[PDB]
C-alpha cells in the first residue's frame, strides 16, 4: 500500500462504490479512497448500530469486493487486501 502522496486509480467495481459516496474524480490518494469508503459505509449505515467498529458488508456491493460478510475497523486487513486488488498505482 503506497504512502500519503502516491496516486492511485481504482478499478471499476471500487470506483462505482466511491462514486456512490460522492467522488467526482478518477485518481486519488489512498487516504482519499479511505475517505470515500468511510462516507459510503456511513451513508448506507453498514456499521453495527451498537458496536460501531463492526461493519456488516454482506448483501452490499462492498462485501462483494471485500469478500467477507463483516469486518472490524480495528482489523482492517480485508480492506487493505481489497485495495491491493482494486488499486492501480500511478
Amino acid at each position: 500500500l503506497p504512502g500519503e502522496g502516491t496516486q492511485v486509480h481504482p478499478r471499476a467495481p471500487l470506483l462505482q462504490i466511491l462514486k456512490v459516496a460522492g467522488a467526482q474524480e478518477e485518481v486519488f490518494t489512498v487516504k482519499e479512497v479511505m475517505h470515500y469508503l468511510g462516507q459510503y459505509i456511513m451513508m448506507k449505515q453498514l456499521y453495527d448500530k451498537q458496536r460501531q467498529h463492526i461493519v456488516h458488508c454482506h448483501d452490499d456491493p462492498l462485501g462483494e469486493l471485500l469478500e467477507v460478510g463483516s469486518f472490524s475497523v480495528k482489523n482492517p486487513s480485508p480492506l487493505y487486501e481489497m485495495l491491493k486488488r482494486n488499486l492501480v498505482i500511478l
Binding site: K31, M34, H35, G38, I41, M42, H53, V55, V73
Partner: peptide
C-alpha cells in the same frame, strides 16, 4: 459509545 465516523477517521488518519 464511539461513533463509526470517529472510529473510521482514526483508521484513515493513521
Amino acid at each position: 459509545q464511539q461513533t463509526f465516523x470517529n472510529l473510521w477517521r482514526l483508521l484513515l488518519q493513521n
